[PDB]
Amino acid sequence: MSLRSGNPSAASFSYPDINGKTVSLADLKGKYIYIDVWATWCGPCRGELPALKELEEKYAGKDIHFVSLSCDKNKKAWENMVTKDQLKGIQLHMGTDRTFMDAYLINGIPRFILLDRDGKIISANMTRPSDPKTAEKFNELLGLEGHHHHHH
C-alpha cells in the first residue's frame, strides 16, 4: 500500500505549532505550500534563516506558505529557541514521529519541499531558500516576471 508497506503519510498531516497549536494541512490548504526543515541542533540553517524571513517579508502576499517542520525531539528547548531566534512565521514541530523524516529522505536541514494548493506534494526536493533559483520559481509561477525573470 501507501509508501511501500501501508502507512498513512503526506495526505494531510497535523502537527503542533510552537505555541501549542494544532496546525493541519488544512490550515495551509488553498494556497501553495513550501515545507522547509528547521532544527535546534542545526546550525547551517541559521545562516539562511534570516534570509528566509527576507524571502517571506519580501514576498508577503504571495501564494506560498513557508512551513518549517522540525524533527527535534526537544520541543520546549526548541519552542523557546524559536522564540529567542525570532524565527516566527508558519511553523510546525514533529518531535518523535520521524517516520515522516525518512519518508522524504530528509537529512542535513533545511530540506526544501513544495506542494500544490490542494496539499499535493509537487516537489519532494524543491529549492533551498538561500538558493536564488527558488525565488525565480516563485516569481515565475506567480507570473511575476517583468517579461521574464531577468528583464529581456
UniProtKB/TrEMBL annotation:
Determine the domain of life of the protein's source: Bacteria
The listed locations are: Cell envelope
Q: Which residues form the Thioredoxin domain?
A: 4-144
What is the designated name of this protein?
A: Putative thiol-disulfide oxidoreductase
Q: Which organism is it from?
A: Phocaeicola vulgatus (strain ATCC 8482 / DSM 1447 / JCM 5826 / CCUG 4940 / NBRC 14291 / NCTC 11154) (Bacteroides vulgatus)
